[PDB]
């Protein structure tokens, strides 16, 4: 806040600015595809 006051009028304590803290947590977006060894070995696509 910014106060106005006057000539010869005492000055009140203005409220100090506030600070906010955003906690951006990290979280693992994992992929766990259980492919069989059958597909990898049999196919010529190299499915990995």
């Amino acid at each position: 806040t910014v106060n106005h006051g006057e000539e010869g009028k005492t000055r009140e304590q203005t409220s100090t600015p506030q600070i906010n803290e955003v906690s951006i947590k990290l979280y693992p977006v994992y992929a766990y595809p259980r492919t069989t060894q059958e597909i990898v070995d049999f196919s010529d696509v190299d499915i990995l």
Partner: protein
Amino acid sequence: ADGGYTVIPELNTEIMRMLTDESTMRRICTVKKISSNEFKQLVSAGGA
């Protein structure tokens, strides 16, 4: 105690695999190394 601990039994480092045998199936039959889940051999019935 009388020099009996000194004598160690010489373990033959080649274990005798009792159930070993040359695979008669793989010898009498043909072996086709392949890269696929299914193997299609074409066997002409005849009729010509």
